[PDB]
Structure 1
Amino acid sequence: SKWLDSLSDSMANIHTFSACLALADFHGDGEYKLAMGDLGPDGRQPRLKVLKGHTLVSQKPLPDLPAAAVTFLMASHEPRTPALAIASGPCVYVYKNLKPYFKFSLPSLPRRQTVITTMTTLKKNLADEDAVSCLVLGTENKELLVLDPEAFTILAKMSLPSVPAFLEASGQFDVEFRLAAACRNGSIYILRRDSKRPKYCIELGAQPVGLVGVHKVLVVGSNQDSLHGFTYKGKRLWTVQMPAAILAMNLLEQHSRGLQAVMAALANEEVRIYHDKVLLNVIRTPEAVTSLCFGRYGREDNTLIMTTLGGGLIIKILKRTAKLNVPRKTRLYVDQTLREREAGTAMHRTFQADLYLLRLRAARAYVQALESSLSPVSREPLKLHAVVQGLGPTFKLTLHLQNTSTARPILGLVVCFLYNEVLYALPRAFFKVPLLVPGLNYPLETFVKSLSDKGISDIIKVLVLREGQSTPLLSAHINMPMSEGL
C-alpha cells in the first residue's frame, strides 16, 4: 500500500486516452482542473469533459472525435491562463478559459480531407515550465508539422516514411529538437534539424502501443507485451517483459524525489515495471485501466488520474512519504523383484503363452467384425459415427460421415436404418448420400421418435453401403436412450 485512493468510480462513462487527457488551470486563480477530450461510448458523442475535484461540471460537445487534447503555455513574458488545443480532423480548436475561442485548419494541398492524429509540445529557450512551448503534430497524409507555440504560422514541415501513431519531443527549438515519431509501420523515426529525409529509423519488430521519454534513454512499449529501452542514437539498450498486455503508458514525474519512471497500464489490472535499482510502479485496480495522467490535480502535486475499460474513473494520490520427486519403493516392490529374480522363466513362458492366446482371440474378434461389417472406420475410405441429441420422445440422430482420402470423391452411397418398427418411427430410413468431398464432415440428420408408451429403449443400426453392391461398407450402432416423454 503506497497510494491514497481519492476517488475510484465504477459506473460513470469516460472513454479517453492518455494523449487526450490533459490537466491545467485553463481559467486561472491557481487551482488545477482536468480536461479530457473523449469520444464517449463510441464515435457518436465526443464531448470535452472538465473535472474539478470529484464530480463532473461541464461537457462541451465536439464536432468529431478528438485525436488529442494538449495543454501548453502561450505567454513567455508574464504567463497568462493557458488554453487547451484539441484536434479533430483537419481542425485544431484553441480553447481559452475552456470556452470555444479559436479554430485553425490544415493547409489543403492537392476535396481531399486530411486528419491530425497526434499532438505534442516542445520548449523554446530555457527548458522550464514558465517558458513557452512549440507545437508538434502528425497527419495521416505523411507529414509532421512543428508549429509556433501559438499556432498561427507553419514553422517546420517534415516528411515521414509512414503514417505516424505516437509523438514525443525533447530539446530546445533553436539549439536542437529531437522528434521521436513512433509510426504504425512497426518502427520509430527520430527527426532532427535540417532533415530533407528523417535519416534516422529504428526497428522494434511491431507496432508500438506508446512511448515515454526519460532524460537520456527513450522507452517504447511493444504490442507484444514488453518494454524496450533504447537510446536516441539507435542502439537497443535493455528489454523487459510484462505479465499482461500493455494498454497505455505515460511519463510519471516527481520533482521532490527525482524518480522518473514509466506508468505502464496492463490488462491484468496492474501497473508494473522494474526500474534501475528500486521496485516501484506496482499498483492494482479493479478493472483494466486504459488511460493515465500523473499530474498536479486540485492543489496537490502528486495526483494520478486513470480511466479504465468500462468507463469509470480512478484517482490515486501519491503520499510524499514515498530435490527430485523420484518415487518411494516399498517392501512390495522388493519382494516382487525377488520373486522375479528367482522364477523369471515361468513368468516369461506364461506371458508368451498368454500373448499368443491374446493375438489369437483378437484376430478372431477382428475377423468376426470384418465378417459382420460392424466396424465404423473400415480403398473405400470412409468413417461414420452417430450422435443422439434430445431427451424427449423425439431425438435428432445426426450421422457424421466423412470420406478420408487424399483426393477422390465417393459417388454411390446410401444409408439404411435397421430399427424396431414398433418402438421407433423414422420418416426416412433409406436415403442417398451426397458426393463426399475428401476431407469434409457431412452431418446427415434424422428424427427418431420413441413410440413406446412406456420407457423402452432399443438399438438402432446404420448401414452405409454402395447402391450396386449389397454388403454394408460399414455399420454404426446407437443405443437409443430412454424415452422420458409422453
Structure 2
Amino acid sequence: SKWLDSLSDSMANIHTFSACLALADFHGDGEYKLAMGDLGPDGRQPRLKVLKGHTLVSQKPLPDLPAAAVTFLMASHEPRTPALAIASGPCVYVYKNLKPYFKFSLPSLPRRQTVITTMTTLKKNLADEDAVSCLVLGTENKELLVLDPEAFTILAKMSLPSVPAFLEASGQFDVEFRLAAACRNGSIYILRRDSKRPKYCIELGAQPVGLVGVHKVLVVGSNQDSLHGFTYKGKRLWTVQMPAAILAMNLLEQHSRGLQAVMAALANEEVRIYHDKVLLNVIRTPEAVTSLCFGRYGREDNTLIMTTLGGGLIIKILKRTAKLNVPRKTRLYVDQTLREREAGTAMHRTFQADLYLLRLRAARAYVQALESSLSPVSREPLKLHAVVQGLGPTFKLTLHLQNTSTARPILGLVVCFLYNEVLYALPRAFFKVPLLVPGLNYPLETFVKSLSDKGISDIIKVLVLREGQSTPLLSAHINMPMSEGL
C-alpha cells in the first residue's frame, strides 16, 4: 500500500490525453497548477481547463482540438511562470499566466499548409528548473520544427520519412540533442547533430502507442500490449510483456530517491510503474485510465493525476516512505481379451468374410444408384441438394446447385421435377439453369403447393440433366412434410 489515495471523482468529464495535459507553475509562489486542453465529451467542443487543488477554476473555449500542450520558460529575465504553448491546427497559442499572450503561426508550404500533432520542449544550455526551453513541433507534413525560446522563429527544420505521433527530446539543443520520433508507420527515428535525416531507425513491428525517455534506455510501448526498451544507438536491450493493452505511458520521476521509472496505463483497470525490468507499485482503478501525469502538482513532489476512460479524476499522492484421466477396465474387458486370445482365428476369419460380403453389398448398392442416378453429388462436376422451407399449404423449395471444378463453367443444363400431380401443384416443373460458375452456390427456388385436403406427404424427385441427353446427370429426393392446410 505505497500509493496514498487523495481524490476519486467520476463527474469530472476530463477526456484529455497523456500529452495534452501538463502541470507547472502558473502564478509563481510555488503553487503548481495543471493545464489541459480537454476535448468535448465526444470530441466536438475543444475546451482548455486548468486545475488548482481539486476544484475547477477556469475552463474556456478553444478554437480547435489541442494536439499537445507543454510548458517552458521563454527567457531568464526575472523568471515568472513558464509559457503554456498549446498546439491547435496550424497554430500555437502561447499563454502567459493562463492568458492569451501570443499566436504563433506555422510557415506555410507552397495553399497547402500543415497541422501540428506532437509538441515537446528541449533545453538550451542549463537544464535546470530555471533554464530556457525551446519548442519542437511535429507537423503533419513529415517535418520537425525546432523553434525558438519565444515561439516566433525557426531554429531548425528536420526531415522525417513519416508523420510523427510521439516525441522525446533528450539533452541540450546546442551541443547534444537526441530527438526520438514515434511515427505512424510503426517506427522510432532518432535525430542527432548534423543529421537532417535520422539514418538510425528502429522498427517495432506494431505502431508505437507511447514513448517515454529514461536517462539511458528508451521505452516504446507497442500495440501488441508490451514495452520494448531500446538504446539510443538503435539496438534493443530488453522487452517486457503486458497482460492487456497499453492506453497511455508517462514518466514517474522523483529526485529524492532518484527513481525515474516509466508508467503504464493498461486497459485491464490497473496501472503498473515499470523500472528497467521490474514491476512495482501496481495500482487499481474503478475504470481503465487513459492519461497519467506525475509531478509537483499542488505542493507535493510526488503527485500523480490520472483520468478515467469514461471521465472523472483520480489524484494519488505518493508517500515519501516508499494424475491423468487414463480409463479403467472392468471384468468385461479381461473376459473379452481372454476370448480373443483363445478364439482369435475364428474372429479373424469371420470378420474377413463379413468384410467381403460388405464390399459386395456396397458395390451392389453403388451400381444400383449409378443406374438410377440417385446420387446428389455426381469429369462432369456438379453438386445439388434441395431444401424445403415453410409449413402451411405453400412450401418454398430451393435447390442449392453448385459447379465444383477448378475453372470450367457448365453451359447447357436443365432441371425437371417429378411429383404427384394430384397432391402438389408446381407452377414450372421444368426450367433451365443459369451458367454455373465454378465455386458459387446458386439457389434456384420454386413454390410447391399441397392440394390434398387431407394431410398426405409424398416424395418429390428432382433431376438435373443436359439438354442434349436424356439420362439425368444427377438427382435428389425430398419428402414433403404435412400440409397443415385449412
TM-score, normalising length from structure 2?
Answer: 0.86
Alignment CA distance shift 1:477-1:98 (3 Å): farther
Superposed displacement of residue 115, structure 1: 1.6
Count, aligned residues: 486
Alignment CA distance shift 1:219-1:403 (3 Å): same
More off after superposition, 287-296 vs 354-363:
287-296
Alignment CA distance shift 1:285-1:422 (3 Å): farther
Superposed displacement of residue 109, structure 1: 4.1
CA contact (8 A) 2:212 2:249 kept: yes
Q: Distance in 1 between matches of 2:337 and 2:178?
A: 77
Q: Distance in 2 between matches of 1:84 and 1:151?
A: 11
Q: Which residue of 2 aligns with 1:62?
A: 62
Q: Which residue of 2 aligns with 1:141?
A: 141
Superposed displacement of residue 428, structure 1: 4.0
More off after superposition, 4-13 vs 120-129:
4-13
CA contact (8 A) 1:263 1:281 kept: no
SS in 2 for 1:351: helix
Q: Distance in 1 between matches of 2:485 and 2:306?
A: 58
More off after superposition, 172-181 vs 402-411:
172-181
CA contact (8 A) 1:84 1:95 kept: yes
Q: 5 Å matches for 1:257-296?
A: 257-272=257-272, 275-276=275-276, 278-280=278-280, 282-285=282-285, 287-296=287-296
* Residues 282-341 of structure 1: per-residue CA shift (max 9 Å, x gap): 345455443333344444444444445455555555455546654444544444333322
SS in 1 for 2:210: strand
CA contact (8 A) 1:92 1:103 kept: yes
* Residues 340-391 of structure 1: per-residue CA shift (max 9 Å, x gap): 2222112211211221122222223322332333322112211123344556
Alignment CA distance shift 1:73-1:449 (3 Å): farther
Q: Distance in 2 between matches of 1:454 and 1:8?
A: 74
Superposed displacement of residue 411, structure 1: 1.2
Superposed displacement of residue 239, structure 1: 1.8
Q: Distance in 2 between matches of 1:188 and 1:401?
A: 54
* Residues 36-66 of structure 1: per-residue CA shift (max 9 Å, x gap): 3244356643332334555656543333332
Alignment CA distance shift 1:463-1:177 (3 Å): same
SS in 1 for 2:447: strand
Alignment CA distance shift 1:121-1:373 (3 Å): same
More off after superposition, 23-32 vs 373-382:
23-32
Superposed displacement of residue 23, structure 1: 2.6
Superposed displacement of residue 232, structure 1: 0.9
* Residues 461-480 of structure 1: per-residue CA shift (max 9 Å, x gap): 43322233333322333445
Alignment CA distance shift 1:254-1:184 (3 Å): same
More off after superposition, 215-224 vs 326-335:
326-335
Q: Distance in 2 between matches of 1:300 and 1:61?
A: 30
CA contact (8 A) 1:262 1:281 kept: no
CA contact (8 A) 2:22 2:71 kept: yes
Alignment CA distance shift 1:435-1:227 (3 Å): same
CA contact (8 A) 1:74 1:80 kept: no
Superposed displacement of residue 425, structure 1: 5.3
Q: Distance in 1 between matches of 2:14 and 2:425?
A: 60
Q: Which residue of 2 aligns with 1:173?
A: 173
Q: Distance in 1 between matches of 2:70 and 2:102?
A: 15
SS in 2 for 1:363: helix
CA contact (8 A) 2:395 2:448 kept: yes
Superposed displacement of residue 271, structure 1: 3.8
More off after superposition, 256-265 vs 129-138:
256-265
Superposed displacement of residue 100, structure 1: 2.9
Alignment CA distance shift 1:425-1:101 (3 Å): farther
Q: Which residue of 2 aligns with 1:426?
A: 426
TM-score, normalising length from structure 1?
Answer: 0.86
Unaligned 5+ runs, structure 2: none
Alignment CA distance shift 1:278-1:446 (3 Å): same
More off after superposition, 464-473 vs 52-61:
52-61
Q: Distance in 1 between matches of 2:296 and 2:456?
A: 78
More off after superposition, 72-81 vs 208-217:
72-81
Superposed displacement of residue 99, structure 1: 3.2
Q: Which residue of 2 aligns with 1:23?
A: 23
Alignment CA distance shift 1:397-1:153 (3 Å): same
SS in 1 for 2:313: strand
Q: Distance in 1 between matches of 2:482 and 2:101?
A: 78
CA contact (8 A) 2:240 2:277 kept: no
Superposed displacement of residue 124, structure 1: 3.3
SS in 1 for 2:302: strand
Q: Which residue of 1 aligns with 2:191?
A: 191
Alignment CA distance shift 1:104-1:377 (3 Å): same
Q: Which residue of 2 aligns with 1:10?
A: 10
More off after superposition, 403-412 vs 308-317:
308-317
More off after superposition, 196-205 vs 48-57:
48-57
CA contact (8 A) 2:261 2:274 kept: no
Q: Distance in 1 between matches of 2:276 and 2:340?
A: 63
RMSD: 3.4
* Residues 153-197 of structure 1: per-residue CA shift (max 9 Å, x gap): 322222223332211011123341211122333332221223344
CA contact (8 A) 2:260 2:275 kept: no
Q: Distance in 1 between matches of 2:144 and 2:20?
A: 18
Alignment CA distance shift 1:360-1:207 (3 Å): same
More off after superposition, 169-178 vs 57-66:
57-66
Alignment CA distance shift 1:60-1:364 (3 Å): farther
